[PDB]
Paper text:
S-layer proteins (SLPs) are self-assembling, crystalline proteins coating the cell surfaces of many prokaryotes. We determined the atomic resolution structures of all functional domains (I-III from N- to C-termini) present in the three S-layer proteins SlpA_ac, SlpX_ac, and SlpA_amy.
The SlpA protein (~46 kDa) is the main structural component of Lactobacillus acidophilus ATCC 4356 S-layer, built of two domains. The N-terminal part, exhibiting the first two domains (SlpA_I and SlpA_II), is known to be responsible for the self-assembly of the S-layer protein into a regular lattice. In SlpA_ac_I, the first ~20 N-terminal amino acids are not structured and reach out from the protein. The crystal structures of SlpA from L. acidophilus and L. amylovorus and observed crystal contacts reveal the self-assembly formation. A second interaction was observed within this crystal structure, a symmetrical homodimer interaction spanning from Asn92 to Asn176. The assembly is propagated in one direction by alternating SlpA_I dimers and SlpA_II dimers and in the other by the pore spanning N terminus of SlpA_I. The self-assembly region (SA) is formed by domains SlpA_I and SlpA_II, building a 2D crystalline network that forms the exposed surface of the SlpA layer. Furthermore, the flexible part of the N terminus (aa 40 to 49) traverses pore 2, very likely further reducing the dimensions of the pore.
Numbering used by the authors: 32 to 42, 49 to 65, 70 to 194
Write the structure that this text describes.
Amino acid sequence: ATTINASSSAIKYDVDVTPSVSAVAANTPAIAGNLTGTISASYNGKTYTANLKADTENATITAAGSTTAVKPAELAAGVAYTVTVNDVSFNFGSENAGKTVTLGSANSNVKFTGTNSDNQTETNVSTLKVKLDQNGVASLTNVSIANVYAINT
């Protein structure tokens, strides 16, 4: 360690997490809104697709003011939504067992909730230092992405 750092986070992270979400607004003569997407991570020049606990009700959309889940069916154009994906994990493989890594995103709107390498819960943080398990898996309580807009088509 030879590098001056007055911030809590290491240089500013070695795993770039990239959620790609597509929100489609409902129509007012009715077209049901939809929301779909995946989560990708870069690590040691490789891309990895995130694994989820469930294929159903594995994420929650919220408008501001309210913790109340918004039906994908009744998304509105022009409203800032936050998407909170639960029980996210990455399988970085057995060759990466036991490595300590920092998760971050080049997207400011992305936050993480999970257990860090010092075994503390952190909520809605821009970076999380985790220890990969004996199989090279990183587990997260959730990943949030803010300022998702449903597009009118």
